[PDB]
């Protein structure tokens, strides 16, 4: 509903689609979105622009696609244009995939340009192993582990990837996975 981790440098977030643009400014509680009001079990894509103001002028830090997955209770940011403030000083066309979402958590699928992904995982309360397929990457397995509040007051899987790292958060009555292949380190999500 409210995504504060998707904002950069305490700036703005202009998501724009269908001839409408809403700017979520950080530091204000009025920013909100659909708590599953958009279609569930479907990736809804938005065009986002991250901006800050320096000495009375707005500067775009990044832009690209912004996709969400809806359930009863994962935000993904496909950057297409980011700034090289360290070397070039120019807004380059560098493409990078990230995950910056969370929802309503309880207390106790997609990848880069690959919308058709299946998340088939199971876990039993022994104290989370899962298999992920239907992707460009050949053969990825989530490694089972224990769960705890971990100071987040919510159960967290904090599993691994098979040499990897995965994180799945329980909700209801949602996750992100990092994998490293030979070609590049691919970012995968769980839903």
């Amino acid at each position, epitope marked *: 509903l409210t995504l504060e981790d998707s904002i950069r440098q305490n700036g703005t977030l202009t998501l724009s689609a269908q001839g409408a643009e809403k700017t979520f400014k950080a530091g204000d509680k009025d920013n909100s979105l659909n708590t599953g009001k958009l279609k569930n079990d479907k990736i809804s894509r938005f065009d986002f622009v991250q901006k800050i103001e320096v000495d009375g002028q707005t*500067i775009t830090l990044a832009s690209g696609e912004f996709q969400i997955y809806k359930q009863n209770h994962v935000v993904a940011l496909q950057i297409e244009k980011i*700034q090289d403030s360290e*070397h070039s*000083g120019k*807004l380059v066309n560098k493409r990078q995939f990230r995950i910056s979402g969370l929802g309503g958590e309880h207390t106790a699928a997609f990848s880069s340009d690959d919308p058709n992904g299946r998340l088939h995982y199971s876990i039993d309360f022994t104290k989370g192993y899962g298999r992920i397929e239907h992707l460009k990457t050949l053969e990825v397995e989530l490694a089972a582990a224990e769960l705890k509040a971990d100071e987040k007051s919510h159960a967290v899987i904090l599993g691994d990837t098979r040499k990897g790292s995965y994180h799945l958060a329980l909700f209801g009555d949602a996750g992100s996975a990092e994998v490293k292949t030979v070609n590049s380190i691919h970012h995968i999500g769980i839903a």
Partner: antibody
Amino acid sequence: QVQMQQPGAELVKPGASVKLSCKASGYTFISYWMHWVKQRPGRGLEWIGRIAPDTGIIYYNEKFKNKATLTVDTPSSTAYMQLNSLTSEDSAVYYCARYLKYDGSTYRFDYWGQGTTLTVSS
Amino acid sequence: DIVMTQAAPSVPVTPGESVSISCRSSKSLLHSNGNTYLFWFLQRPGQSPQLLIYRMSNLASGVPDRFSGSGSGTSFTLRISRVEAEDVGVYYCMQHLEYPYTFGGGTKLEIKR
């Protein structure tokens, strides 16, 4: 307002070293790179190098690799430039200029220091 | 290094007419992002260079409407629609697409009166 103060002139003996300063005021100093430009007497503007007070990186012109040394002090909002083993061909005017680290602004080379007239002679 | 050439060393003009100052590059100053990184500068005698045109065509804050910017890849021109006497000075083009940033030679505006 944005003001960049440079010493009017500086005389030194040949073979010595000099550290030119360029103070800054009126803008978020860490967000802007600092470029240095030499204009010799007669004609010609040479770009020397840029220094980033945020990243600490210096990009330099190879012609001034062993001639120029760029340092910055963010607290004092001043950038420095040390010239080394000075010869007669270094008698020139040296400018500083701000350059926002971000693309898409009107804040690149839009404010220039008044210049430092460096005369090197015995 | 990119080589900026200003073929005209000086151009004469009578007050009220139009002037064109040109500048050529060794390589296209168009980046893949589509932005052409070219600046136009005016250096008045005994003064620091002053930004006139940015992004090859966009006028800079404080620059009079008389000044105009145009260009392509490897070809760029600055235009003064009606030249006044305050426009006397040397005009410098400059690339900032690649290090080292390089200036042009400079074209002096001469006023025939």
